[PDB]
């Protein structure tokens, strides 16, 4: 596919909420509270999309990679790591 910078509107914020909810199921960083997705957010095409976000949760910053299937709209958290340096 092709990588691009995308906005941080509702769609993108919800991807960040998803990432935190999925992290919380795994419990890797304990139970986090989604704050916000900050810039920059990146998207690639895959049949679907891959998203790489900076996610603020419980006042710390994480990087999350999320995939989304085009036809079903089903999502997967691929990676959730941090804390990371600010962009």
Numbering used by the authors: 1 to 46, 56 to 96
The paper states:
Monellin, isolated from the African plant Dioscoreophyllum cumminsii, is, together with thaumatin, one of the most potent sweeteners known, being about 90,000 times sweeter than sucrose on a molar basis. Wild type monellin has a cystatin-like fold, composed of two non-covalently linked chains, which dissociate when heated above ~50 °C. This is accompanied by taste loss and prevents the use of the protein as a sweetener above this temperature. To circumvent this inconvenience, single chain derivatives with higher thermostability, among which MNEI, have been designed. All sweet proteins elicit a taste response upon interaction with the human taste receptor T1R2-T1R3, a heterodimeric G-protein coupled receptor (GPCR) located on specialised cells on the tongue.
